[PDB]
Amino acid sequence: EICGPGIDIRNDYQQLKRLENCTVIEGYLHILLISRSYRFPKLTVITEYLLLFRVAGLESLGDLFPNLTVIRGWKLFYNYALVIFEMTNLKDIGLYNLRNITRGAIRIEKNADLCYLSTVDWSLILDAVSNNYIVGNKPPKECGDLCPCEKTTINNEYNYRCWTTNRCQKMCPSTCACTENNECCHPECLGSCSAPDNDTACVACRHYYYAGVCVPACPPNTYRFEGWRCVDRDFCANILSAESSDSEGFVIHDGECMQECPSGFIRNGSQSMYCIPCEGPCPKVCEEEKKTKTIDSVTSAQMLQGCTIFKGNLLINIRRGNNIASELENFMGLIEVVTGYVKIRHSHALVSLSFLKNLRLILGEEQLEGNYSFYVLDNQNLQQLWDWDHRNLTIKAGKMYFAFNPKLCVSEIYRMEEVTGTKGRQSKGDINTRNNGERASCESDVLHFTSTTTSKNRIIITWHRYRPPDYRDLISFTVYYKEAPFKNVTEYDGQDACGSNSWNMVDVDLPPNKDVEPGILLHGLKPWTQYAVYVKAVTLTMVENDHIRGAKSEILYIRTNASVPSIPLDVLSASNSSSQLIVKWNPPSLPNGNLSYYIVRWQRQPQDGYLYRHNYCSKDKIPIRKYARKVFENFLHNSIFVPRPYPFFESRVDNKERTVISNLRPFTLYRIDIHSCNHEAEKLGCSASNFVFARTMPAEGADDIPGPVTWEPRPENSIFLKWPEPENPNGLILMYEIKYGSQVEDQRECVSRQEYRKYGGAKLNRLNPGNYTARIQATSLSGNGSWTDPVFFYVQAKTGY
Amino acid sequence: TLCGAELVDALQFVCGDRGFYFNPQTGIVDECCFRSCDLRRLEMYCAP
Amino acid sequence: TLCGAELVDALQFVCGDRGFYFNPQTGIVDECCFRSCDLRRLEMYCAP
Numbered sequence A: 001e002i003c004g005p006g007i008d009i010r011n012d013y014q015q016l017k018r019l020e021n022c023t024v025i026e027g028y029l030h031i032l033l034i035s036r037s038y039r040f041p042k043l044t045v046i047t048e049y050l051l052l053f054r055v056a057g058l059e060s061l062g063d064l065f066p067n068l069t070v071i072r073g074w075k076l077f078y079n080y081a082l083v084i085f086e087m088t089n090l091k092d093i094g095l096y097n098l099r100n101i102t103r104g105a106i107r108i109e110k111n112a113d114l115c116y117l118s119t120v121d122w123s124l125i126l127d128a129v130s131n132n133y134i135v136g137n138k139p140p141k142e143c144g145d146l147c148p149c150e151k152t153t154i155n156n157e158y159n160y161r162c163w164t165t166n167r168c169q170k171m172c173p174s175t176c177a178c179t180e181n182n183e184c185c186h187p188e189c190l191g192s193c194s195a196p197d198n199d200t201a202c203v204a205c206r207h208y209y210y211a212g213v214c215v216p217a218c219p220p221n222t223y224r225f226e227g228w229r230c231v232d233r234d235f236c237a238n239i240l241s242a243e244s245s246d247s248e249g250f251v252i253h254d255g256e257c258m259q260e261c262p263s264g265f266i267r268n269g270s271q272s273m274y275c276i277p278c279e280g281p282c283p284k285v286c287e288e289e290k291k292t293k294t295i296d297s298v299t300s301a302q303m304l305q306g307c308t309i310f311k312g313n314l315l316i317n318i319r320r321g322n323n324i325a326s327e328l329e330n331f332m333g334l335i336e337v338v339t340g341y342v343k344i345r346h347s348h349a350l351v352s353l354s355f356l357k358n359l360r361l362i363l364g365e366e367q368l369e370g371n372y373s374f375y376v377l378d379n380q381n382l383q384q385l386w387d388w389d390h391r392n393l394t395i396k397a398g399k400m401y402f403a404f405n406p407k408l409c410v411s412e413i414y415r416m417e418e419v420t421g422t423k424g425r426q427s428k429g430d431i432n433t434r435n436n437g438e439r440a441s442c443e444s445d446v447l448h449f450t451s452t453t454t455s456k457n458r459i460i461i462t463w464h465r466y467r468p469p470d471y472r473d474l475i476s477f478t479v480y481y482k483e484a485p486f487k488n489v490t491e492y493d494g495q496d497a498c499g500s501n502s503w504n505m506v507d508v509d510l511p512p513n514k515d516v517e518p519g520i521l522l523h524g525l526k527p528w529t530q531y532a533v534y535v536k537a538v539t540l541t542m543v544e545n546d547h548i549r550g551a552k553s554e555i556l557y558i559r560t561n562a563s564v565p566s567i568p569l570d571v572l573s574a575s576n577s578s579s580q581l582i583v584k585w586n587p588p589s590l591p592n593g594n595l596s597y598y599i600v601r602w603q604r605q606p607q608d609g610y611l612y613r614h615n616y617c618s619k620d621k622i623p624i625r626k627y628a629r630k631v632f633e634n635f636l637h638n639s640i641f642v643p644r645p646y647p648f649f650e651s652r653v654d655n656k657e658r659t660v661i662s663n664l665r666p667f668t669l670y671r672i673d674i675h676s677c678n679h680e681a682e683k684l685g686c687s688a689s690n691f692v693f694a695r696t697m698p699a700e701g702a703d704d705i706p707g708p709v710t711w712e713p714r715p716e717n718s719i720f721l722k723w724p725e726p727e728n729p730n731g732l733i734l735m736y737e738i739k740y741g742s743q744v745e746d747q748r749e750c751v752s753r754q755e756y757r758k759y760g761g762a763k764l765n766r767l768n769p770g771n772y773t774a775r776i777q778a779t780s781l782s783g784n785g786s787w788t789d790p791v792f793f794y795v796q797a798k799t800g801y
Numbered sequence B, C: 001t002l003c004g005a006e007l008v009d010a011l012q013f014v015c016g017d018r019g020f021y022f023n024p025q026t027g028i029v030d031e032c033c034f035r036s037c038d039l040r041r042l043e044m045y046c047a048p
């Protein structure tokens, strides 16, 4: 009896009755928020994970599932195969038949009455014992882990192993997968054995299972289902994934029966039970229930995001809107094939259809009345289609109708049917010159630029004076400029006459004096940046001749002059060793040219002069300087509760943004200046410095006493200890400590650095007679040194011969 | 705002014997713990 | 990020003997304490 594909028991205590027949639970198991005696000896295997949470009244897990042997953990709950969290009244994990947990780890948390945690050797039940989490339970010091058997090494200890107070932890002998009492199971077996080394007598199969047999790999005409058994071809032809609009059956792939084809695979036509390898980015076909998808807003086009093929019809009716050309191009820019027709009606905001880029095929399953597959009408601002000489298009069936598109030149739609392939298919009234191309300026003159002058942020550019075709026409100019990273720039990139998507526009008038030519000064530009500039003429014709001409200039690419680069970004430094400093950074924000190299500088910083003056045997704190469960509860709550509906040294780094400085004074502060030059830094000069401070590693063993300690008797019953000073300490020696005593070095003397500078040592004054031992330790800025070797001195009771 | 074990205590209190319904990880913590939620929002996490 | 007395310690360290210049309460705390600032931004708070 298999139960699945997911058991979620909660609220009602009596709802647990759903496990009365289940011997295997396909999927996870949830026993949550439960508030008598229920026994389920049938259950032995759980494929995924097991979760227990806030079950009141339950005292042990053996009360419910005594025969639970294997938790395969095919799919894990936050990388855990068993979660026992906030279980009140629970006293022990009574799963005394649990043998193997195949995958995930365990998280046992917040069980104030749970014992027998350390009595379980989880190293022989699961593998990833390091990633377990057993915190917040009843402390083993305040429990009483008592057995009523065998034992082994747990961590560094050796102690007995028991699941509960009546049952021990069962183990197999070293000769073997064993039965109840010392007989090894089959190699393909797992857990216990109804009979020794038999395929049909296994409580749980390792690898896979089929027809009562523990098989390594599935038989030839069977496939992997879930992670423990094998099913035939007709079984997965009856499975149905979670219900959606694009929900279909399961697929057979790589001898496995999964829900959907893996990444880089798509379902084969007709034979929809197998996955065929699509080489490119496999399509995301979008199927909508409504016959004709109307795009009357940017919010309506959102449902077409990421679609490759569209099974339906497109009706574009965009009157108003925001920045539309860049927005629709995010949604509809990936659509490549339209099964039906495309109608652009009343789309006044659209000046170009360029947002339909990858659209290379329009079929014609359904066509508008009159057999039309492409139908545009009343587009007062559509200057151009998406049909420029770069894009491809193919309309398989249907005609094209164009009417009341005034800004669209009639020559552009004649060029469309060349690639479209419908040259002589339309009628004489489908494409008419009367209401189309009415306000369009097709054949236009050419404005010629005359001179360009470039700085680091200003550009002066002038074009030739333009005499209009008629004497009466009032003439004005308009400068279109924008930052273009590279040259593939089209003149159409906005929407309507409000599309501020890209081109910056400045209206400059024709100068009064006829000797000076019209020009424009651009101010506030990024240094070393390629700008696309072109000028258009504003010819206001007094005699409205429908032989519209106009003037337009070539796209001129102008790059400004380089400047001083920006400071390097985020300078971080560390010290992996003494006399070494590693530093990393990011390229500057505004490089202002091609990056060539970086110039780093490091300067020795002096030790603090205030540190040398104070007597640190009186101060309590000596200064030290350095070198170089909620998130799971949120996941458990987000899943359970578902609501109902010194000089400077200088070096140049050639390529990378990382470098290591060598030869440094150990435990010394350093200023790290980093500059960023470019190709024009030889004349302009390299950039400024983004600096940081870092201290090297302390020289290990360099702040201890470098010689033996000597002693000399002094007046009274005194002893004058004398020891050499560390030549190269880690920064500075602040104080010394003398540890002396007769039998135990009990007395301790503090020696300041100022005291040592006067006498070269310390005088232990007035001691009781007897033999003594002494040890001295130097404390530097990085820390203390090691104690010296014990020196032996005696205090005579009567200083004499 | 209710969070953690303090949250599930109020959830068991509001539902009481009614229980919790069950049948995209922007769950109740991102609703009643990250932001302040009233008890009417909590009750909608119960059963019918 | 540097804040409070920890901040003015680094400011006196960076400027040193150079001093601090002086001559809309979105000051240095809303620059070097609210957000992370590098030592180049700190040095611009010193004197010439």
Ligand SMILES: *[C@@H]1O[C@H](CO)[C@@H](O[C@@H]2O[C@H](CO)[C@@H](O[C@H]3O[C@H](CO)[C@@H](O[C@H]4O[C@H](CO)[C@@H](O)[C@H](O)[C@@H]4O)[C@H](O)[C@@H]3O)[C@H](O)[C@H]2NC(C)=O)[C@H](O)[C@H]1NC(C)=O
Pocket (backbone or CB within 6 Å): A454, A455, A561
């Ligand atoms: C902004 O940067 C622009 C380049 O990105 C500058 O445009 C460049 O300007 C220079 C000088 O005005 C111009 O001439 C360069 O090439 C000449 C030919 O090699 C060179 O003249 C040589 O011969 C002279 C005698 O025959 C001799 O005296 C001289 O030393 C040279 O050996 C001239 O000196 C200079 O090397 C470039 O052709 C021009 N480049 C472009 C692409 O237009 C512009 O001036 C900069 N403007 C500012 C304000 O900084």
Ligand SMILES: *[C@@H]1O[C@H](CO)[C@@H](O[C@@H]2O[C@H](CO)[C@@H](O)[C@H](O)[C@H]2NC(C)=O)[C@H](O)[C@H]1NC(C)=O
Pocket (backbone or CB within 6 Å): A100, A101, A102, A123, A124, A125, A126, A127, A190, A206, A207
């Ligand atoms: C529980 O049984 C599984 C059976 O697969 C054991 O999994 C082994 O895992 C290691 C490491 O990934 C593989 O090298 C082995 O090949 C796996 N075994 C088999 C039979 O394929 C797992 O080690 C067992 N755990 C315990 C504690 O016995």
Ligand SMILES: *[C@@H]1O[C@H](CO)[C@@H](O[C@@H]2O[C@H](CO)[C@@H](O)[C@H](O)[C@H]2NC(C)=O)[C@H](O)[C@H]1NC(C)=O
Pocket (backbone or CB within 6 Å): A701, A783, A784, A785, A786, A787
């Ligand atoms: C600083 O002093 C501590 C103890 O006062 C030193 O740590 C001891 O090091 C010895 C080895 O020489 C060990 O046998 C002891 O067990 C250590 N004791 C402790 C409490 O750690 C430490 O080595 C000294 N610092 C340096 C750089 O030598």
Ligand SMILES: *[C@@H]1O[C@H](CO)[C@@H](O)[C@H](O)[C@H]1NC(C)=O
Pocket (backbone or CB within 6 Å): A486, A488
């Ligand atoms: C120009 O073409 C290149 C290569 O296809 C592309 O990286 C770039 O984005 C294009 N320009 C624009 C403005 O999209």
Ligand SMILES: *[C@@H]1O[C@H](CO)[C@@H](O)[C@H](O)[C@H]1NC(C)=O
Pocket (backbone or CB within 6 Å): A770, A771, A794
């Ligand atoms: C001190 O040590 C010496 C040598 O071990 C020993 O002879 C002597 O008895 C000890 N005691 C005194 C008081 O000198």
